[PDB]
Design a protein around this ligand. Structure first.
Ligand SMILES: [Zn+2]
Ligand SMILES: [Zn+2]
Length: 250
């Protein structure tokens, strides 16, 4: 009826311009932001939420040189941050997992998806379809022959694990509402808000459709008023300071 453990697992980092967390801002200063994956230990088995950055980012800050985001995005990833290595340390191999949940298919959330060729990968149909053609999607993030479990809208993965459709930051972005044994209700916004102020204060941030992102935030706020969860944001360096991370769980 509840998830036994929820682990916050650091998966490397990334430098972005600060206008990414506040659209109104003028570019110049850099921000070293956390990249996260999460692992859920459940009665039915372990579930991994997101898979970190692509192998091409390892020891390669200059990954995006040449492209349309040169200098605006610098991955900070070492060999330890490869998702397979992360799992090996938590104590699993890819084929051990019950499901992978892709919040969305941006490079910092699905770069490791290719490592999982048997596990069903739960992703929104609108995200998948967008990844097939929009330019912000890397080939590592859409590989054609993985075992996708394509869903549309809200969805219960296993008891205590609910996906909430929250498009806007990307066309098919989804957040998680989790009931854990130790903490009760937890809302993982993922990138439906990078920071606490994108959420509470509705400050605009990096995204595909800000009108949609705002209505997804208002939808999450209705949920919060009802369930009163503890809430964790997608890329928030102030909140990161106090987050209990692996090997602690919540
Ligand atoms: Zn994203
Ligand atoms: Zn992200």
């Amino acid at each position: 009826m509840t998830v036994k453990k929820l682990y916050f697992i650091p998966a490397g980092r990334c430098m972005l311009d600060h206008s990414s967390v506040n659209s109104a801002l003028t570019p110049g200063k850099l921000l070293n932001l956390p990249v996260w994956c999460y692992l859920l230990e459940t009665e039915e088995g372990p579930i991994l939420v997101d898979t970190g950055m692509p192998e091409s980012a390892v020891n390669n800050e200059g990954l995006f040189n040449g492209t349309f985001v040169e200098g605006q995005i610098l991955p900070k990833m070492t060999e330890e941050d490869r998702i397979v290595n992360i799992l090996k340390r938590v104590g699993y191999e890819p084929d051990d997992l019950l499901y992978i949940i892709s919040s969305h298919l941006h490079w910092d959330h699905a770069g490791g998806n290719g490592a999982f060729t048997n596990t069903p990968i739960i992703v929104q149909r609108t995200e998948y379809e967008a990844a097939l053609h929009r330019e912000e999607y890397m080939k590592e993030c859409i590989l054609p022959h993985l075992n996708y479990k394509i869903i549309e809208g809200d969805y219960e993965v296993v008891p205590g694990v609910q996906l909430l459709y929250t498009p806007g930051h990307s066309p098919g972005h989804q957040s998680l509402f989790i009931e854990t044994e130790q903490s009760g209700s937890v809302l993982l916004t993922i990138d439906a808000s990078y920071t606490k102020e994108n959420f509470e204060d509705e400050v605009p941030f990096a995204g595909f459709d800000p009108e949609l992102a705002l209505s997804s935030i208002k939808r999450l706020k209705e949920v919060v008023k009802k369930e009163k969860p503890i809430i964790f944001f997608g890329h928030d360096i102030e909140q990161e300071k106090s987050c209990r991370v692996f090997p602690e769980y919540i």
